[PDB]
Design a protein around this ligand. Structure first.
Ligand SMILES: Cc1cnc(Nc2ccccc2Cl)nc1-c1c[nH]c(C(=O)N[C@H](CO)c2ccccc2)c1
Length: 335
């Protein structure tokens, strides 16, 4: 017998079906590896999570599992298999088996210059997947380059649905609403930040802290209008913003001198301060910049909207642990 697998001192008890592990990434309460599947004869991605000590991690874990099990779309990552201990007393870790992708957008932007057509094509696939997510009445809430996975043929899939929620983060990609004390339009903002980063290979709003984040935003958009501020904003944020000196709006064509003016027009409509005036996903797909890829015939939507039977916030982590145990039962031999 081989014994339990191990990656960087950390156990990976992924049975005899999954072997040849390599580190490919990490998260807050887990680690991602690639592995050889001896059944399907492919290498896969295994996501190990260890959520049980924290009630929030348990919540995210259950939420990600229920959603990815339900969603079925080519621009969304799925779950092919889930491994965990045969008993609830023994369950300290959950392993989620997923299609292996070549890399993420974070890394690609780190060493590659994108042509306009590739920007255009990546943008299309993000929005297409976001169409499905939003049709399901779900917010991803953490769109960013490292959560966008790419394969050898530039196919794109959204990953990490841990922060995903039923319709009502990373600082650089979070909408001004979020920080001003939300709806589907927070994802559009993130997609905007991502477009801007594909254009110049650098984040458009790299705030060191939440305050510095709001500065960077206003550093391009200009001082907020009266109506822009009026949104049940917290006293702190509003007073500070009102105390700042005037900031002039920087034109997109000056910040991205060589960018397709169509790309910039859409970029403008996504990075709109006021979320009510921000472009929605379908209107985005239909934008002239994407005409070459827009195909309403081939852009599927969720059969029905998503809903949670129980209110997960209210549940103690021991109740949540039980639910993760049950949700993952169907992947258990016998069953
Ligand atoms: C699911 C998946 C499939 N393939 C790859 N490939 C890949 C991506 C980037 C660099 C190199 C490679 Cl080979 N990656 C993934 C993947 C990437 N991130 C995650 C993921 O879900 N991460 C979250 C945090 O973002 C996480 C991970 C562990 C524990 C909690 C949360 C899966």
């Amino acid at each position: 017998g081989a014994g339990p697998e191990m990656v960087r001192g950390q156990v990976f008890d992924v049975g005899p079906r999954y072997t040849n592990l390599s580190y490919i990434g990490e998260g807050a309460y887990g680690m991602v590896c690639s592995a050889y599947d001896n059944v399907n004869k492919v290498r896969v991605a295994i996501k190990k999570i260890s959520p049980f000590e924290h009630q929030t991690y348990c919540q995210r874990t259950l939420r990600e599992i229920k959603i990815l099990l339900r969603f079925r779309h080519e621009n969304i990552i799925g779950i092919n298999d889930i491994i965990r201990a045969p008993t609830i007393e023994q369950m300290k870790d959950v392993y989620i088996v997923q299609d292996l992708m070549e890399t993420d957008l974070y890394k690609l932007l780190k060493t590659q210059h994108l042509s306009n057509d590739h920007i255009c094509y990546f943008l299309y696939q993000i929005l297409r997947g976001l169409k499905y997510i939003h049709s399901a009445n779900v917010l991803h809430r953490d769109l960013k380059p490292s959560n966008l996975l790419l394969n050898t043929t530039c196919d794109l899939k959204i990953c990490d649905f841990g922060l995903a929620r039923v319709a009502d983060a990373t600082r650089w990609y979070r909408a001004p609403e979020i920080m001003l004390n939300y709806t589907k339009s927070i994802d559009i903002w993130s997609v905007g930040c991502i477009l801007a980063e594909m254009l110049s290979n650098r984040p458009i709003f790299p705030g060191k802290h939440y305050l510095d984040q709001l500065n960077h935003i206003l550093g391009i958009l200009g001082s907020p209008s009266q109506e822009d501020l009026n949104c049940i904003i917290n006293l702190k944020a509003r007073n500070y913003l009102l105390s700042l000196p005037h900031k002039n709006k920087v034109p997109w064509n000056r910040l991205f001198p060589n960018a397709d003016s169509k790309a910039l027009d859409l970029l403008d409509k996504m990075l709109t301060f006021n979320p009510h005036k921000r472009i929605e996903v379908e209107q985005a797909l239909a934008h002239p910049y994407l005409e070459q890829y827009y195909d309403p015939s081939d852009e599927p939507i969720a059969e029905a909207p998503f809903k949670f039977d129980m209110e997960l916030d209210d549940l103690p982590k021991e109740k949540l642990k039980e639910l993760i145990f049950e949700e993952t039962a169907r992947f258990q031999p016998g069953y």
